[PDB]
């Protein structure tokens, strides 16, 4: 394990690492990076690296832009490809302002304050995320398509052509980068796949979500395919979620487990669910962040469009797996892989902590098929829906005292101005569906 | 003029009419028809015509569907094409249930009740509509396209090729059916046109908007072109409205005119504007009936997306033109040519009548550019906007007691259930624009 | 008969095609030949009675009962080809259930509101591929049989039969029309009413020919099977 800069510099000389790539994200989830020649790396440890902070917060506003990244040698990781030139590695850091205080617009910093709030109450958060993607073909120019690589279904042994070898090479690359995958499997849609990661501390796991996406996309490109994390690239088949499994720990023990209760779940696991239900509508804009996210959040598929919890029903917005003991987890099913994982995990934590502190009851479970009910019956059960498009998500989050305080004003207001712009652009587009339905009709 | 059924039977014999077409609309505005041989017509006058009422009200419920159409001779009008087979006419009438009561679900009936309501207070309503449309090319299979016939602009003398003759032939066909056109011109967008109806009695004018649509379409089709009444066929240029000029009359005098006021407008005109503004939000789903309607109701073009009234400003939702005396009129600018004119004018008449009854002051005019203002300025001014998409317009109508009582429950619920279905179909569609924005990004 | 070739020849000579297929296109409506019928005696409409609550005569109900009794047994004649049973599937204008009604427009037998000398019974299941001499004769015999033997039609069905369960309709005793040609053939081969109405020569010829048409179609491997199974198996 690397802990000091001497470890990393020793590892760079020994493994012949020639390139050191930084790894962060902007407010909106986009993965960002610049390349450091391993010759510069010793000065970067000693003095940090000046960079333009508009890489994170965008250019919209006159605000301080001269940020410094301090490298965390414990986050140093060698990437699973070997150019002729020598090896490449990624590394992360903490972003500071020129005055020496931390930049509060860095999404990773927002996760750290959420982590700090939990440790104040004695807990830490573990997450094991389940990531879905499509494996599509490239066209003749090497550019992405939505063309299928198989027609398999849920848990099929598919593909069995050369796409079989490409899928295996993706799993191998992540495994031998130290990810420790639990399992992977073909998902419901044709060409759709899932990878289950091991449970780790939320910070370590969010860092790995960012690495995962560009590692997979690059490996696929170099074998002649494309890996897509679009929430819904195709109509009439399943969309792709990023199911987020979580538990709290204290004193070495799973806070959610209670051997003595009838269901073996503690009262604080119920309060954590109640606080998630109380606030999830207020940050669907964060877990489901693009226009297409709301083409997956429609009835008919895996995706959960109603607010409820359950143990017996596999489909609810929040589900409780049968697992007990230290593997007791809660599973929130609405996020998709477009979400900025630092922000998604941060708000998930704050909501559950607020539930625990304020003793928020989650109500009774919903063990029935909600989509089979009628809107009268769902009203009788107090079953609200998630926001149905990006705009309704924008308006819910814009009013949320909980989201503004958990994110800070900078991130909260940049996120909303950027998303509102995205919505105003889309809501004016005249789509071919409209010409097909209307052109001959009117 | 056609006054008696003997007038129509003589004209049929004298002018060699071999087919009579019925003309009506369904709940949602689609134009409906069946053909009657001239040999069957005298029997048709004597006993009415039985037909299936699913043509108006649809199939979705088990409800009485054997209807009787009683032919109104005074609506007999010969169509402006002469097949070698012989002449063709259209005719309208009144729909009855098998017990002998009028069918309340026919939109034209809905209009006739509104006309009765105003006559109970002394008034009858004139309308002069201004119909915008595009003229497009046909592809090789004679299929509609959105391909342009000119690149002209506002009031240009355009087109000047073979399409100049088609445009003149459209004006000629309507005028010599007896429409009495006032003026036609090229409108702002490429290939866009407008024809200004004669200010006339609302019932007969609504009959004319239906005739106008298929006469124009059929004339253009037979010349190799396509006439499009889509609100917004093309992103980035003007959409097509149906602005609706209207006035009330009592005892043959225009009650919107008062020579002894500074504006030379009576107070009842102001109460009528006041009623229209009070309810326009609640029936935007009727004036703006399809998903495409809300691609036109966006800022930047001729379309009014803000609730206000003005004399000066051409931007207003309600504009009062300079004309005074007998041609004093109020112009409502939001409707598009896909609406059902029977319902759209009826609701307009009922909203304004409710203003005169309740003496609803319209507030102050708005003489500024509303698009140039900030939200707090519009908020300070109390300037509200129209529904931003069809779903919002559905939700607004569904809550409106005023629209329900004016339309009648059968029409009210049928209309909303069908628009709710169209929206649910649209909202799930993954559009090409989403693949362009996200496929390579995510 | 005249109509079909007249319409076809007119359309061909204008550059178009007039098609009388039951179901030329999946996922839209098919084409039927609804057959409205009146019976007359002494100059008067047998089905009209000014004194009954619905103004239908008793023989009208007996006529309906006869049609309901036998219709399953000559679906093979009113719905003659393999493609006919792609129209007789739920979801469209086609009536796939055996029932009568005045209120529901989609019942197998419908009574329009018209009374008087124009009182009529609409039998909705036939399609334009049927021999109309054979269809109209079988409808006439069946109605006549209902009147001679006083066959009650039972209760009308005023609700949506599709929106009921398989048990719900069995609770109502509502039967289906045959699901395919082979099934319609087997219903007709065992019918004495159909055999006597057509005569033995017609009965046997018709059945042997349709049995050959089905034996051909059932062995075809359709492109839908490749799309569903080639990758799968």
Residue numbers in the entry:
A (entry chain A), B (entry chain B): 6 to 447
C (entry chain D): 215 to 447
Give sentences from the paper.
The enzyme, glutamine synthetase (GS; EC 6.3.1.2, L-glutamate: ammonia ligase) plays a central role in cellular nitrogen assimilation by incorporating ammonium into glutamine, which serves as a carbon and nitrogen donor for the biosynthesis of nucleotides, amino acids and lipids. Here we describe a structural dissection of the archaeal Methanosarcina mazei (Mm) GS and its regulation. Like the Gram-positive GS, the Mm GS active sites are formed at the interface between two subunits in the hexamer and are comprised of five regions; the E flap (Mm residues 303–310), the Y loop (residues 369–377), the N loop (residues 235–247), the Y179 loop (residues 152–161) and the D50 ´ loop (residues 56-71), which is the only active site region contributed from the adjacent subunit. Like other GS dodecamers, the Mm GS dodecamer is formed by two interfaces; hexamer and inter-hexamer interfaces.
To determine the molecular mechanism for this interaction and the basis for GlnK1-mediated GS activation, we created and purified the Mm GS-GlnK1 complex and obtained its crystal structure to 2.3 Å. Strikingly, the structure reveals the Mm GS dodecamer is sandwiched between two GlnK1 trimers. The α1 helices of Mm GS form a crown-like structure around a large central pocket at the top of each hexamer. The GlnK1 trimers slot into each of these hexamer pockets. The GlnK1 trimer core, which is structurally similar to other PII proteins, provides only long-range electrostatic interactions with GS; GlnK1 core residues Arg21 and Lys25 interact with GS residue Glu19. Indeed, almost all the contacts to Mm GS are provided by residues from the GlnK1 T-loops, which extend from the trimer core and insert into the crevices formed between GS subunits. T-loops are typically disordered in apo PII structures, but in the Mm GS-GlnK1 complex T-loop residues 44-52 form a helix that fits snugly into the GS crevices. Each T-loop makes extensive contacts with residues 20–23 and 87–92 from one GS subunit and residues 19–20, 84–87, 171–181 and 220-228 from a second GS subunit. In addition to hydrogen bonds, the GS-GlnK1 interaction includes hydrophobic and van der Waals contacts between GlnK1 T-loop residues Ile48 and Tyr49 and GS residues Ile83, Pro85, His181 and the side chain of Arg87. The interaction with His181 requires the rotation of its side chain and is the only interacting region of GS that undergoes significant structural changes upon GlnK1 binding. The finding from the GS-GlnK1 structure that the GlnK1 T-loops brace together GS hexamer subunits indicates oligomer stabilization as the GlnK1-mediated activation mechanism.
